[PDB]
Ligand binder design. Sequence first.
Ligand code: WXJ
Length: 167
Amino acid sequence: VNSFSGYLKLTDNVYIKNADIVEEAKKVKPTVVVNAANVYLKHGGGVAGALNKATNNAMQVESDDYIATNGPLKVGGSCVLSGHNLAKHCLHVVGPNVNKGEDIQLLKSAYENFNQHEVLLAPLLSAGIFGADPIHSLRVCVDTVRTNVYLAVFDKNLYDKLVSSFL
Ligand SMILES: N#Cc1ccc(OCCn2cnc(N)c3ncnc2-3)cc1
């Protein structure tokens, strides 16, 4: 039993809710919140900008030190950093950005990072400003992630489209 509330069960291990990931995190304080990161951990907009703003820029400060030490992530890769006031840990995962021409096949590699964590609160990778089709992202999630994932979708219209088209 866990404290995630109000989710639709899609499969044995994937759940989805019409919800704000920052509010979910503030409420649940999950062990892991996933960020929709880029390779430079520059949290300017989208989910990343929202998560970072909610940490009062502490996520960005920590991320800048990470990059200065380690260099950029790979597309499809991840790193574990602090979750600050939102979660124990933040798993920064880089999905391909279609607006940068990146290969959508890398979306599966991106979701594989979730399997290193037993339970996660997450957005749909490569959705929104990353340019991919969120219906496709949800399908790859369900077909790749085997651990327990709680997906938070910002927009009622999108949430209803995802549910009503889910096979
Ligand atoms: N009109 C409209 C509209 C406004 C924001 C919006 O956010 C999508 C990405 N996103 C950003 N910030 C958050 N805290 C999120 N939680 C889940 N997804 C999140 C989508 C549609």
